[PDB]
């Protein structure tokens, strides 16, 4: 139940909301996103 | 019980007494559709149950793993292999009598003797 | 302003397994009287099975409040699904049950 | 007990996939009145069909 | 009535027909064109829109920055297409909703003028239902009545 | 009592059928036929 | 996966035994009150009564279930339209988005995600839930029927 | 190789298990031995 965890759940938790975006309006508008990658463990 | 449904509305055909003909109809309370009363009964309560006690009976009934066994004949086939179980009415006060099923013709037959 | 092109174009919608539909994103129907078959275009030979003889209240329409350019193609004539050559189809099917991920 | 372990579970996708290709008619098309004795097929509490 | 182990000493020692061709339909017409599948719940035997009624009219019926939630395009597109499709006369009426259960693996065999056919993928299906046929509605008229 | 089918019926002098349903309920429910309320299984014992 | 929901549809059985008013309501989240069940079949597009009993009583032959079903049906007879039904619910939970054009969207919106978060959370599968629910009812009767 | 099958609670409702194989599987004594049930099943 730990080998299961470290391998898969950790990543699937990342992949759910890698992304979140911020859009700045101008006077043409901006839009800032940031997204995550696959997870690396030492 | 045993009540029809509308046509072109397919909704439950409620009793509507005809006073003129001195009789009961059956309508679609959604639309116009109505129809006469074919059985002078209306309703019933039927407190008691001896219905369904053969539930799960299938021509695939033997294939069950864990109904134990015996040898009685088919009261029709005279076929003496069959399987048993108890009253499907898993009600409280039900009696024990055992429902048997031919494995030649699936002939139902119980084990009580007081009334067949 | 809905338009009715035919509403009677007899059509046979089919459901498919994944591979051929994916390969479909021609052939030749060898009806046999009713062991209907189809000679695909090269590839395998998949017959016709009659998923539903008679098909009703179901028709084909098109698109181009806000209405849009919508036409009535035709009625579903008869529903079919597919019998998928066979062992390889059977092999890949069981093989398909063997996916993986990183 | 000594001889017990715990399902650490998996994806159910390949399973569903199988039954799809194996006669488990989709639910939506279920018409009971005419198909009285269909065996319901559940997965993880999801009555698929 | 004992415990014996060295049986590794033992175990290591004891060891007619009618053809009908097909054709994947040209793609440009598909590219310009959207087609989908009609389904009715009338329980009417065929319900041919031919014998339904005329006419037919089927149709759908600076500051600072901020956070936007994220959705895939097809969902936004289809969510955006929430206006239910409606065919009318000006008399009976039909509307449906999307089903999302069986739009994937679906190609149609257009019985062309020839015995041959073409294969056409399925974009959408819909389930138009008759409505207002006996035309009773009490939007809040039975609602406030309900509390009785 | 001589009848094998112990059957009893009644009629009254909208739809009467529903009061009957209310009516037949109370009949079954709240009409004791004898014996005091709240008391059941008069169990002998020596 | 997805916010690990704790959403508990409950399907209460009003009515002590024998008594009439054997009605059945269900307690969908974010909804102020318990909603009669037929209002929900309708809410998922099954208007007609005959279609309804298909979803719940899996036999044209047992009628007893139908009998305990009887009162629960007229419970719905008030409503006959999905949108009225859906509007009804719109009138029933956390009324902030006054726009009925946005509110009945919302009772739709909720019943997309916020109800049986399993078998789906997306448009279109509305009927499939209407079975699963329509099944849960069956057992509730079936149990209370002592079978 | 399909020799032994992992089994859980829910699954057990559906099956009919045997205590000891030699005890039971073949269809067919000390006073000091505990008395043991039959292989009718
Ligand atoms: Zn009607
Ligand atoms: Zn027999």
Swiss-Prot record, chain E:
Highest taxon of the lineage: Eukaryota
Entry PTM: Phosphorylated on Ser and other residues by TAF1 and casein kinase II-like kinases.
Cell location: Nucleus
Function: TFIIF is a general transcription initiation factor that binds to RNA polymerase II. Its functions include the recruitment of RNA polymerase II to the promoter bound DNA-TBP-TFIIB complex, decreasing the affinity of RNA polymerase II for non-specific DNA, allowing for the subsequent recruitment of TFIIE and TFIIH, and facilitating RNA polymerase II elongation.
Family of this protein: Belongs to the TFIIF alpha subunit family.
Remarks, miscellaneous: Present with 1920 molecules/cell in log phase SD medium.
Assembly and binders: TFIIF is composed of three different subunits: TFG1/RAP74, TFG2/RAP30 and TAF14.
Name of the protein in question: Transcription initiation factor IIF subunit alpha
Gene name of the encoded protein: TFG1
């Amino acid at each position: 139940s730990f080998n299961q965890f470290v391998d898969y759940t950790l990543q699937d938790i990342i992949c759910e909301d890698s992304t979140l975006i911020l859009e700045q309006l101008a006077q043409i508008s901006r839009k800032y996103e940031i997204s995550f990658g696959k997870i690396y463990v030492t | 019980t045993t009540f029809r449904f509308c046509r072109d509305c397919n909704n439950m055909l409620y009793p509507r007494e005809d006073k003129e003909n001195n009789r009961l109809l059956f309508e679609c309370r959604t639309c116009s559709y109505v129809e006469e009363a074919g059985s002078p009964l209306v309703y019933r309560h039927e407190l008691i149950t001896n219905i369904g006690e053969t539930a799960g009976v299938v021509q695939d009934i033997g294939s069950d793993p864990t109904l134990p066994r015996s040898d009685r004949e088919c009261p029709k086939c005279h076929s003496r292999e069959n399987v048993f179980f108890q009253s499907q009415q898993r009600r409280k006060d039900t009696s024990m009598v055992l429902f048997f099923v031919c494995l030649s013709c699936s002939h139902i037959f119980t084990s009580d003797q007081k009334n067949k | 302003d809905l338009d009715l092109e035919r509403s009677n174009r007899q059509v046979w919608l089919v459901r498919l397994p994944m591979f051929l539909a994916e390969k479909w994103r021609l052939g030749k129907i060898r009806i046999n009287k009713s062991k209907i078959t189809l000679l695909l275009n090269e590839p395998h030979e998949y017959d016709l099975e009659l998923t539903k003889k008679v098909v009703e209240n179901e028709y084909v329409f098109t698109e181009q409040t806000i209405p849009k350019k919508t036409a009535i193609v035709g009625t579903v004539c008869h529903e079919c699904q597919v019998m998928p050559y066979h062992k390889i189809v059977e092999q890949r099917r069981n093989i398909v049950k063997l996916n993986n991920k990183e | 007990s000594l001889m017990s372990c715990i399902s650490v579970g998996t994806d159910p996708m390949p399973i569903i996939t199988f039954l799809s290709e194996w006669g488990m008619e989709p639910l939506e098309d279920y018409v009971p009145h005419q198909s009285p004795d269909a065996t319901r097929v559940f997965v993880n509490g999801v009555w698929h069909g | 009535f004992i415990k014996r182990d060295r049986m590794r000493r033992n175990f290591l020692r004891m060891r007619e027909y009618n053809e009908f061709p097909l054709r994947a339909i040209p793609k440009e017409d598909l590219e310009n064109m959207r087609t989908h599948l009609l389904k009715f719940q009338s329980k009417k035997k065929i319900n041919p829109v031919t014998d339904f009624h005329l006419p037919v009219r089927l149709h759908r019926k600076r500051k600072t920055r901020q956070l936007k939630v994220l959705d895939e395009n097809a969902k936004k597109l289809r969510f955006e297409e929430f206006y239910p499709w409606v065919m009318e006369d000006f008399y009976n009426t039909w509307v449906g909703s999307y089903e999302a259960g069986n739009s994937d693996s679906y190609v149609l065999l257009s019985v062309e003028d020839d015995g041959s056919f073409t294969m056409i993928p399925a974009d959408k299906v819909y389930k138009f239902t008759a409505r207002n046929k006996y035309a009773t509605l009490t939007i809040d008229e039975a609602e406030k009545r309900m509390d009785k | 009592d001589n009848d094998e089918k112990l059957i009893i019926r009644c009629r009254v002098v909208a739809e009467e059928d529903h009061m009957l349903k209310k009516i037949e309920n109370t009949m079954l429910e709240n009409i004791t036929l004898r014996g005091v309320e709240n008391i059941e299984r008069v169990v002998m014992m020596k | 996966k997805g916010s690990r929901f704790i959403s508990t549809l409950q399907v209460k059985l009003y009515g002590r035994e024998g008594s009439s008013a054997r009605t059945i309501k269900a307690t969908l989240p974010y909804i102020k009150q318990d909603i009669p069940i037929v209002i929900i079949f309708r809410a998922l597009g099954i208007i007609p009564d005959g279609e309804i009993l298909e979803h719940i009583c899996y036999d044209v032959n047992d009628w007893q279930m139908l009998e305990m079903l009887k009162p629960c049906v007229e419970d719905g007879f008030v409503i006959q339209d999905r949108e009225t039904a859906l509007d009804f619910i719109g009138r029933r939970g956390t009324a902030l988005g006054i726009k009925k054009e946005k509110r009945i969207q919302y009772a739709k919106d909720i019943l997309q995600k916020e109800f049986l978060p399993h078998i789906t959370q997306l448009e279109g599968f509305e009927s499939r839930k209407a079975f699963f629910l329509g099944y849960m009812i069956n057992r509730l009767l079936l149990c209370a029927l002592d079978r | 190789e399909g020799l032994v099958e992992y089994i859980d609670a829910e699954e057990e409702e559906s099956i009919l298990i045997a205590m000891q194989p030699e005890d039971l599987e073949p269809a067919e004594v000390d006073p000091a031995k505990r008395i043991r049930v039959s292989h009718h099943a």
